[PDB]
From a paper:
A loop substructure is present between Y205 and K215 in the HearNPV P26 structure, while these two residues are located in a single helix in the structures of VACV poxin and AcMNPV P26. Mutation of the key nuclease activity residue H66 (H66A) led to complete abrogation of cGAMP hydrolysis activity. However, this mutant did not show a compromised ability to inhibit PPO activation, further confirming that the nuclease activity is independent of melanization inhibition. The results showed that the protease-like triad of HearNPV P26 does not overlap with the other two.
P26, a homolog of the viral-encoded nuclease poxin that neutralizes the cGAS-STING innate immunity, is widely distributed in various invertebrate viruses, lepidopteran insects, and parasitoid wasps.
Residue numbers in the entry:
A (entry chain B): 18 to 208, 211 to 266
B (entry chain A): 19 to 208, 211 to 266
Write the structure that this text describes.
Amino acid sequence: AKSLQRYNVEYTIDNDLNRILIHKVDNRTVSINVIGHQSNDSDTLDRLHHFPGVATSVMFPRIDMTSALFVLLKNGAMARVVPEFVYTNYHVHKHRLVYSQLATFALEDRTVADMVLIGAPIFRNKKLVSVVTHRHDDRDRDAVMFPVTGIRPRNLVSGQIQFDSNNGVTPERLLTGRSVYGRRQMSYLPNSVGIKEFALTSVANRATFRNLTRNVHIFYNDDEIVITLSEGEFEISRIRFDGPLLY
Amino acid sequence: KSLQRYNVEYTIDNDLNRILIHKVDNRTVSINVIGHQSNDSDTLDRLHHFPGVATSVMFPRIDMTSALFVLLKNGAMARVVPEFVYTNYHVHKHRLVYSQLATFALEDRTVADMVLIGAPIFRNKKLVSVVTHRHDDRDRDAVMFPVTGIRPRNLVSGQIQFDSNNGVTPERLLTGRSVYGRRQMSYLPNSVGIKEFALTSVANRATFRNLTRNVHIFYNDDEIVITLSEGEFEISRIRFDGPLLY
Ligand SMILES: [Cl-]
Ligand SMILES: [Cl-]
Ligand SMILES: [Cl-]
């Protein structure tokens, strides 16, 4: 297999897995690995930059929500896209959650969207800035949405959380009439003790939960994301910011 | 005797240059402007906490385009638009409460000096928040006033429980340094340098397990980094836009 080239990127197309593999950037060998929401926990990813959905030996710089980018298509042409939307994505590697709001572009033409392969280079002023990781067919917008992973854009939030649990992180939809405390979402009144008594009881009993297994939960709806870190049932921390969550 | 404006009953305290709100919506309330560190009274525990306040009344979400009216010491009101974003925080009983907040600016310092700590802030003739902190943004040459309450859309809020009795003291992130956990360091030694420090701390994670939890807030004009650490091991970080109200 001989490598194709575009701008500062040498790559190949893998038709079995329907992916693009980047072999060189700026004239040297790189490792750019698209991760699902959960990595394989390989030690060799430890020494790479992590942004949601990717572990990369190459820095992905900050983009804004107004400048045009060019994403490489399966046929060698490129699509001009403006990442003016905001979606949140995440992955877990070795008991560390990496999450961020990310600038996100949309493709209304699903013929073009199907030509965008996992791992496809995303260019800004003829230099690689990111690669295609995840996609989400948005019902309400009737468009396929593509986050552009990399360094946190201005006006958005990113973070990381170390936890203990081996089941990883699985986001859960926040049901109507429920509020979150720690690991749990509950209605205000009992039935289940109810969120107000639970939160008060968990805080009062802080010392019994000290040093127990740390769990991270991600509660989402269309409008809001809540991320909590808990030990036992005690909520060590919470973060709240705008959805949508790419999931 | 109490003064009354819209749904609020209040008094002006001249000795302390602050406004005390006694009633909202025909009932007795407790609205307490907190510094960056509360006195840790148990009576604040059952109140709503938003940065700089503990309040028995809900402060609803505001947007950054609609007009608000802040009550002045002379009984008149200033029309303000909270179009700016600042971050504020306070600590109550080893819990940090922080949030980006919609913030208005007063360029006229004579009017700003008529805005008192605790002054009611009105939206459509109903209390929505109160004046808490202010900041002379000598860059934009205006006095900035956060409007504390529920996190506005597009902004971030959070809370972190920690152990240390010394509270949280923000620190300016110096040029050429990067943060890991409790520390900001340059990349190369002279100490150990942040790259070597972060790797060693992550490798030695189990040696810091269950040690004292500290929260640090690292800031410059453009960015705020908030970390939670046990010993030197960074449990979590969050990064978002400055400025910090401090
Ligand atoms: Cl590049
Ligand atoms: Cl981060
Ligand atoms: Cl919060």
